[PDB]
Scaffold this active site. Structure first.
Site, short mmCIF file in Angstrom:
data_model
loop_
_atom_site.label_atom_id
_atom_site.label_comp_id
_atom_site.label_asym_id
_atom_site.label_seq_id
_atom_site.Cartn_x
_atom_site.Cartn_y
_atom_site.Cartn_z
NE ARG A 84 77.24 -14.75 3.53
CZ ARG A 84 78.53 -15.00 3.33
NH1 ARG A 84 78.92 -15.96 2.50
NH2 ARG A 84 79.44 -14.29 4.03
CB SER A 85 73.35 -21.96 5.91
OG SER A 85 73.85 -23.26 6.11
CG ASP A 86 77.49 -19.00 1.93
OD1 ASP A 86 77.49 -17.98 1.24
OD2 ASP A 86 78.05 -19.16 3.04
CD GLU A 87 83.46 -20.70 5.04
OE1 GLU A 87 83.17 -19.49 4.94
OE2 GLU A 87 84.52 -21.09 5.60
CG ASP A 125 66.81 -4.45 14.05
OD1 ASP A 125 66.53 -4.87 15.20
OD2 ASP A 125 65.95 -3.91 13.30
CG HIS A 137 79.08 -17.09 7.19
ND1 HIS A 137 80.39 -17.22 6.88
CD2 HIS A 137 78.45 -17.52 6.10
CE1 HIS A 137 80.60 -17.69 5.67
NE2 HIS A 137 79.41 -17.93 5.18
CG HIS A 195 69.04 -4.55 18.23
ND1 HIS A 195 67.87 -4.58 17.47
CD2 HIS A 195 68.73 -4.31 19.51
CE1 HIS A 195 66.87 -4.37 18.28
NE2 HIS A 195 67.36 -4.25 19.48
CO CO Z 1 82.18 -16.38 7.97
CO CO Z 2 66.00 -3.99 21.21
#
Ligand code: CO
Ligand code: CO
Ligand code: CO
Lengths: 210, 210, 210
Positions: free
Chosen positions: B56-59, B73, B78, B114
């Protein structure tokens, strides 16, 4: 065939949940399409719920998230059973906040950072930052607190205005009573207010994309 | 009604993001349908992004993932705000890698295992293994490093060729300077190269299913 | 355009997986629409798989989940390669449970609590509680065990009837041999049986919504 579903859903009928409930979500809150919100949940105004968060109020209920709070990516909210199969409220698993009973109470202007978890019975007071990968269970975190990344509060009350150092797991009330205080020179002293400002603006920006 | 959405999306308009950006993803990378990739993101060739990951590259922006890297996973990427609402770059929240500025820089042949998390400002050098449930924030992890499962690097520079033992939370530069070295007899000495080989093959196999 | 996919899928063809396999799931198990289940996986009766869980049997295989077990929100099951590209079984990455070989074996009446992870090679014995945010890797956890929240077992065998205190990372067999015993007065002594009862009822309630 493709998986078709609603990500905002009622909880299932069980022996402790005769009548299913659907989430009550303020029109100004933004629920990402890849978040899940189930059951007896109240979400306040200007709240951002990010991808991969799971708010599940199907065991212990209700789960409340106050105004201008944020539930970041991969955060989980769930709770221990609050009413047994014989219809009796399990008082040890119910939190009291201002005369109302909750399984999980998240106050106003609270940040639940990425991959954190708040498991009921639990309450998190206003203007508190729950850091990345942190954990809260069977605890009451006061207002204006900071849980640094990887900290945890289990079975305790964290007094108002205190912080838990990164990686520290607090499991006794004696330890919680001696936590350090947030002061202006503390590294996370201004973090929550900045995070809430950013997240309230992200909720509105994302709402404008739906 | 069913939740209908795009999992690869532009970021929202905010006071620090006048012009929305959409991810730039190499045609050889595989993005699982249950992963989320938002905003000003660059994904290199042969990268595998697994179920429940959230990039998420929004901030803070941009977020880069180099060639032949993997984002497993439930991994979250961020970053803290990189430009304030007055249009000024917040230099403390911007990482420099080869003359270019990033919020989060993930190098080439890097494994984010993960449930790990890399939060900007941060940089992770090539051929580094970031273990299961590990955490990187406000840090620069050098090349050929190993973060064992549940380790963390906060506010530090991890020298090239070092490892962080499982469960250790490194928060001071003095501690980071004394981390142990990767040697051929170290248990995770060959882990990253095997993981990158497996993941580059999984990316191609999964691409052949889309 | 909208992201259209199946969340229960076959694994990809790779050099160690000539013939793709699809999950074998008992008709009484409930797989949330926002969970992911891939590849050579067996899921037993009355199992609940919650939102954001990822069960991925595409590297090490197979991954088994026994009857009346639960895989809670954000839990990941994955495993190291069990067969190399030259067709040879990697015996160090294969677990033996009752004469059958697995990458990950989750027994019957086992709870994998929210955000936990069990990474193969690994086995978790019946009637064991793997707590919130816990980690199991390269280990065999016996029956009737408790991993408290944030505990971890790496490279060890946890004897039957033992518990790992919250936040403790167990990496040596000497440490595992000295873990404390579950007794009736231990705080989590009755937790798993209650959790399995609740989760078997949730699986049925959720099945009635599909
Ligand atoms: Co953050
Ligand atoms: Co693994
Ligand atoms: Co729970």
């Amino acid at each position: 065939t493709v998986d078709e579903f609603s990500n905002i859903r009622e909880n299932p009928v069980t022996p402790w949940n005769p009548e299913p409930s659907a989430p009550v979500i303020d029109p100004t809150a933004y629920i990402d399409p890849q978040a899940s919100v189930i059951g007896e949940v109240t979400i306040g105004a200007n709240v951002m719920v990010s991808p991969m968060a799971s708010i599940r109020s199907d065991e212990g209920m209700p789960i409340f998230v106050g105004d201008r709070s944020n539930v970041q990516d991969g955060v989980v909210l769930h709770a221990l059973e609050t009413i047994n199969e014989e219809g009796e409220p399990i008082e040890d698993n119910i939190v009291e906040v201002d005369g109302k009973e909750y399984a999980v109470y998240i106050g106003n202007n609270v940040s639940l950072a990425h991959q954190s978890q708040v498991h009921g019975p639990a309450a998190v007071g206003d203007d508190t930052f729950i850091g990345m990968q942190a954990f809260v269970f069977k605890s009451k975190v006061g207002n204006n607190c900071v849980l640094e990344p990887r900290s945890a509060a289990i079975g305790v009350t964290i007094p108002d205005g205190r912080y838990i150092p990164a990686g520290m797991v607090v499991t006794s009330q004696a330890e919680a009573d001696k936590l350090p205080e947030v002061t202006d020179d503390y590294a996370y002293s201004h973090t929550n207010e900045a995070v809430v400002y950013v997240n309230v603006h992200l909720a509105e920006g994302y709402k404008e994309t739906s």
